[PDB]
Amino acid sequence: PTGKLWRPVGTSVATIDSLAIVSDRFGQYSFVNEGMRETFSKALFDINMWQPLFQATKTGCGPIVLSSFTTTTSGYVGATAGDALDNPVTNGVFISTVQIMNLQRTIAARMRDVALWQKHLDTAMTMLTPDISAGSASCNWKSLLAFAKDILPLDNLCLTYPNEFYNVAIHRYPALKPGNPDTKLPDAQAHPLGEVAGAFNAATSEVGSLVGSSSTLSQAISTMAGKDLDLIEADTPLPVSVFTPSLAPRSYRPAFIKPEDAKWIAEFNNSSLIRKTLTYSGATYTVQLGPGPTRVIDMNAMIDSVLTLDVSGTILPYDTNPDLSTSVPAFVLIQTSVPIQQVTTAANITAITVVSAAGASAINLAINVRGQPRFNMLHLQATFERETITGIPYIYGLGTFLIPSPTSSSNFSNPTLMDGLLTVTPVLLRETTYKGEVVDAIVPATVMANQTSEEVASALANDAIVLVSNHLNKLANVVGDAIPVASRTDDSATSAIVSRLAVQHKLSQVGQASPTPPDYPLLWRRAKRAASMFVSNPSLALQVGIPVLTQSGMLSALTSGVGTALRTGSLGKGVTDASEKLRARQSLTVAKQAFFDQIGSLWP
Amino acid sequence: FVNEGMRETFSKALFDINMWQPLFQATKTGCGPIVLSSFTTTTSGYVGATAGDALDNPVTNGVFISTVQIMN
């Protein structure tokens, strides 16, 4: 049973309506199921432990028995009259609301009390590493004590109550074994209150540490089910939400990104220059679109973000072409009639809006750093919005210069300030971008081995690629973490892949002389580096031309392997290299024993 | 076998559903409160992981849930 206890308000006959939460002057009795007593007992148990320090310091008020907050009522206990009717409990143990209040504020008040002392006991305990993980190692007690008698700073609490803290301590450190009163010798065994827990944390030499290897697994299992690593290369529309894209604002360096390497950025590849004009704040400036191609951020295929083009440390040659100086650098949109990459001359450019200029010309924004005047780090920045560009077939964001007077000097300059580190930040997660279009769902499998070397590094913050990369990256840490894809152990991961290579290379051999019986020693090893190359750089699985990894099978395969692989690790997964791991722990205890030996001499 | 703690879960899961009782009736979905005592039974025998070790767990009228039930 569970929930609050109910009782037949109509008396005797208890039906699915003659019940009612048995409330009263104390609040409502909620049932205390077996396991929920484990907690409140485990919590109180950790407080009772500090008994010797509560009396010493006259705080506290006696040991806290959980049997002081409960009661022994009886009735039907459920979550609702209907279902509570199927849990007739007699003399169960319930805790009334007003009690659920004290057991709370008591464990809270006492928790402070101890939390404090417990902190002093520690700066003194750990102040001599009472924990080794291979074999033993003593340190003659006299010295030890006479030593901490020093180190411990005058405001601890282990100097005001030595054997009032010691008695608390003995129950937390199975290192300190108190000398028995009637034989005046230790005990071999150490009996700290955490008897079992402390036994099951020792780094057992057979397998690393059960508490470790156990969690590193349940931890990975969490992720595997959580983010949705499963279904990682699913071939079908998936809401961007399914990718929980967060804290995702990637930055670049356009005016370098080739147009074909990333759809969201077209260029004005035209013969001559395209000097246009525009009255901005009265003054008339001339946008240039200089000698080179001047790659500009396209506006369509640009998920309403927060574009913030930073222009700093980048050269600013106002020294040579004086034409450049005087011009306030500024991010400006450019609506063109004919599609760009077909826009020849000025009459082609519909209009030009200065979405964000920089007050003060190019001769105050400068700063000489050895001849080559740089740009005082400043951030121009628009706030592009999907629909502010409705209808408008062609429009481009360009972080240019806005020259107040074009001249012969700036005839080979080309004032694109795009060489600066632009940082787009998708401000509306629901919508992603792929191959130049804005969508609401991705098709994972499509984005695999479909980008090129740099059609990946040039991805646009929160676009399929960047999403089908953030995803693999989780799955990449589950294998990297739990599975042993980094040793000659032909693990579950590199194993799922090997079975694909076989089934694959086996049918490609079917029909024709079949002169080559499948290899296997070579297949195991080829798939080992395939699974390994993945854990290594999760990204690669997106680039066209990557051995194994990019065939449709793998990944879809890998994950579902790694999947079941985590759901069976056992507990002693740590047996892997638990030999050198062990031998390394003995190595430490031998060096730490060496320490105790000095504590033992210096302070005799 | 449905050991003590494993009933805590299925009860804690069903408990969180029963809570929504007033909305199940309102919208004619659901089908009454889900008691975990509708999926189990009261068989008795030896319960272990293998004949060898199951021999040391004679349980009488324990509460087990059959496979087809562990399905519902």
Place this chain on the structure above:
Amino acid sequence: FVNEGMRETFSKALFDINMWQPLFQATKTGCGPIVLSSFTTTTSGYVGATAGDALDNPVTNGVFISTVQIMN
């Protein structure tokens, strides 16, 4: 009052739903087969449209469906 023919409809309607019994269990929705005899009653009195004419229809243990039921 639920005259003979008006039971034909509500039965014909429920009949077309009971049919889907195997799919209701499979998918844990539904809540058992819907018998029309769960919404009615067996009252008895005079049943008409107005005191005057209801006086000429003494029905004993007829099958009537109460408003709140005609709702479910």
Place this chain on the structure above:
Amino acid sequence: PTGKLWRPVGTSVATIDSLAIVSDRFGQYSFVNEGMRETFSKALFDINMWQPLFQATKTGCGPIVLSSFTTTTSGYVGATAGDALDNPVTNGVFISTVQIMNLQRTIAARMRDVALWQKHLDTAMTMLTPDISAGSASCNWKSLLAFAKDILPLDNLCLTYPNEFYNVAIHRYPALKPGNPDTKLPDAQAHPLGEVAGAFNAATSEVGSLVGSSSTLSQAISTMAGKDLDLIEADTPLPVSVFTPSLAPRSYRPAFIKPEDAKWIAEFNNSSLIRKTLTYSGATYTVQLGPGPTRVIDMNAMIDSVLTLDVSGTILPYDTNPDLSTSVPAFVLIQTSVPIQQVTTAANITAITVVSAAGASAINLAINVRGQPRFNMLHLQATFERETITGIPYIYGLGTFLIPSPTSSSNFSNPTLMDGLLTVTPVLLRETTYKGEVVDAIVPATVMANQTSEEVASALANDAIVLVSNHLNKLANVVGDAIPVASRTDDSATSAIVSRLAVQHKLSQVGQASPTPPDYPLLWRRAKRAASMFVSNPSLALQVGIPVLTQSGMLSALTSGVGTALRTGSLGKGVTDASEKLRARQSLTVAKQAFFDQIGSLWP
């Protein structure tokens, strides 16, 4: 109960599983509920009637009692073990499958038998209108008979069995009253087997006809709930499906439709001519875009349809400008760089595809019809598809001419064949079009009083307007039909509106001298023509500038009135003008009595 009968297969105790459809050597007994016996009895009853003709002609096989196909089993009868458990029926009457087969093929075999005779009886019966609808009117039997003894063609069956058909007849026509054997006189009352039914169909002088007025109502009620007339001016997105658009291919006459009168059709309003070229089937032709504006079907905002531009009977002046002749007329798409209505000269037109040319020049397609050579009716025709125009910001469908050699003669011609009757047929109902955009849902209330006089007649086949017109049109026939919106009876329809005008004109009077107390005699009459103008031309309610009808209240109001109005008509709704209607029926019976009077003399 209903369904097949089940019985406890496990015996005695019948639980929700110890049941099983009681099948066997005869099939499965399905229960025959009270009403379902009414049908099979009503069907057999109509066959037994023809008893005298079955014996006469040695066919048949005795009267068909429905009690010959059933049985008296007993068990639980439901649709499934679970629910059949709540219908314990004892000695119910079930019909086994193999029986449900005969009662079927018997009623079918016999039905043919009678269907035939029953047809002969008729050509003779109705061959003297035995049905009047006001007062009576006889026709001395001798004459009548001695008359039909003539007319009836030699292959009837009423001449081979006179009083073998007569006996069947007497039961279908309460007009023929047989003379009683032991008083040798009629009976006043006529006792045809359809005693009641025939009584309740007579046009009762108090109210037209119960059978009529009753149905004309249930009929309207069907529609009202069906199509979804309710919710007719709902203000919120509605799937086009909710409008069941079918059999919907509207035709026009572009090159006339103003661009602003219908978004799906832009025009090349440019100064000079825009002669372009294109190699079509080797030969090089020149698309013209002549002197005038040349309105062309825009491609975007064009729901992938089946455009079929017919060019017939329309002038073809190859007589004057010889330039026109020789050019094969053809529907051609035109992708322009700069948006049309901004496309000045040839270099602007990206490309031109001849989506469908007409084989043979303009001098074989002609046909002289009094000087002015016309176009031999022929249909050019593309099959535009939403996505075949993906990306392509500007593209237009144009049914032009394709001149093989532009000349001075065709300098004021302008070869747009759009003056022809184009017929677009939406080939993909799911997607509609509104104000130039393609959507999947309409917002009804939005399309009311939002189109102009012709922003309606220029609507594009299966576009919101055409959908929010097909809808009102149903609701327009429900009122036109059921409700009396065509008499001074201030009906439920014109009444729902009057209450809106009041509540409306009443608050517009609130605040300020309120010198005008609402009228009402003038409001009733104004709303009467408002509801009337609607029934009249349902469309109007879309045009901006229509009195009353176009205020947001009405319609949303009207329908919900007309709604409840139909759900209460009573049965005697026909009482409306049931006076002149009656007086007109007596008028007919007086003229029909006049007929019987001649049948009575000529053939004595």
Place this chain on the structure above:
Amino acid sequence: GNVQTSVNTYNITGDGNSFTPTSDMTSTAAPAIDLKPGVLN
């Protein structure tokens, strides 16, 4: 088509099933149930 077993009295992939239309029994559930005001009561 994976075997079920009891949920429903028939397996789909069950032994000797048989798709076979007969002009005689035109398959039909219950769509035209009458509910209009006068007719439902």
Place this chain on the structure above:
Amino acid sequence: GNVQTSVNTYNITGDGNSFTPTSDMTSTAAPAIDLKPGVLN
């Protein structure tokens, strides 16, 4: 907020209700139910 009456023991617009957070009882149902392999069994 239209009156209901019995469906549920409390009316929303009912007499003397009271929204009033208390730092003391942080509202919470049951989200973290443990089901992982080792822990569920």
